[PDB]
Amino acid sequence: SGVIKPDMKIKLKMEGNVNGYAFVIEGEGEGKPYDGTNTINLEVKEGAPLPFSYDILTTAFNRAFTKYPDDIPNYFKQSFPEGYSWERTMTFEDKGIVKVKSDISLEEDSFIYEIYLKGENFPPNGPVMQKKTTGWDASTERMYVRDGVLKGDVKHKLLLEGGGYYRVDFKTIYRAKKAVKLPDYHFVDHRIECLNHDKDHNKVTVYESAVARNS
Numbered sequence: 001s002g003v004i005k006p007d008m009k010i011k012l013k014m015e016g017n018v019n020g021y022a023f024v025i026e027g028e029g030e031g032k033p034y035d036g037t038n039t040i041n042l043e044v045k046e047g048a049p050l051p052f053s054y055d056i057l058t059t060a061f062n063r064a065f066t067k068y069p070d071d072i073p074n075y076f077k078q079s080f081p082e083g084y085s086w087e088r089t090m091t092f093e094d095k096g097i098v099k100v101k102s103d104i105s106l107e108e109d110s111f112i113y114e115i116y117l118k119g120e121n122f123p124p125n126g127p128v129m130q131k132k133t134t135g136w137d138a139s140t141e142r143m144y145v146r147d148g149v150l151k152g153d154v155k156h157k158l159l160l161e162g163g164g165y166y167r168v169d170f171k172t173i174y175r176a177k178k179a180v181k182l183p184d185y186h187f188v189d190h191r192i193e194c195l196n197h198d199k200d201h202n203k204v205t206v207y208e209s210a211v212a213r214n215s
Helices: none
Strands: 008-018 021-032 037-046 084-092 097-107 110-120 133-136 139-146 149-160 165-176 186-196 203-214
Touching: 008 037, 133 186
Parallel strands: 008 110
Antiparallel strands: 008 021, 021 037, 037 203, 084 097, 084 165, 097 110, 133 149, 139 149, 139 186, 149 165, 186 203
16 A cells, blocks of 8 residues: 555644634544545644634645546645645635644654644624634635645635625645645635534534545
8 A cells, every 4th residue: 555545544733822712622533535535523622612613723624635636746645755734824804814834744544733723803793703603615726836835725705604604715835845746727626514512612523525626
């Protein structure tokens, strides 16, 4: 078998603060990197109960889990076993901002993520701080090369209870820890879903599907 098996495990820690509220979340899970699916079981270890929408964390909880056709070089799978890091800005239409960074490494058949997240300037009675969001819409991330690394943009939408929407622009820089074959611009279609296991989101399962396709 190769560096990336059809079944891989996940271990992560996120340290973060949102509007001056600190927390630590640990996760373990599994996915099918070639199917482009992954599941993570998350537990709040510090800062329970979280005083904000869990949805601003879930896209931080690994493009190794993306279905890719052979005719698009796979920036992410090529980077292993050394791995890659990413840095992301999420700009919210009400001037909320999240900055998050992650280091993705590999030990045997377990990906390991080290995540740091800072959210600030959320309106205190807005849908994020009042936990009025109901997940992310399906999305398309445009992948493109700038400054010899891979970048992704999403014009994203947070769904609001009552059936409205909240615009969020994602900009991500993905940096392989070694030289890999760079792809031409392409798309990754995402679907991310949350299953909470309790009232306070102390325990949550996140599921994501991701499929790459050509221009």
